[PDB]
Assembly symmetry: C4
Homo-oligomer: 31 residues x 4
């Protein structure tokens, strides 16, 4: 399980997607 | 196909490049 | 050690997490 | 060469580091 997939890869996607949620919301209210 | 390449890797590039398009445009109009 | 894990992967996580620390702090003071 | 290392990985690092150069400069002048 872990060997077939490392948590680093999952975190990478989460960091990008998660950041977008906050960053998108910031610009969502105003351009 | 999928085994040789996971969608997570592709998404990572898209997230970075995609975000840049929006982030770049924001600063494109003004410094 | 290095072969089992490349520094590029580690740097990637650091770049995302590190950037968040600075970016988060910027928005931390003000929305 | 290419098989041992894909351009996607290299681009990922460049995207993060490159973005930081521009993003850092923006905040460099002002907080
Ligand atoms: Br900057 C930055 C944002 C996201 C980053 C993670 N990218 C990778 C690309 C590929 C190599 C590793 C692990 C997976 C797949 C995610 C790093 S680096």
């Amino acid at each position: 399980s872990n060997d077939s997939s490392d948590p680093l890869v999952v975190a990478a996607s989460i960091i990008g997607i998660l950041h977008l949620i906050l960053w998108i919301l910031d610009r969502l209210f105003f351009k």
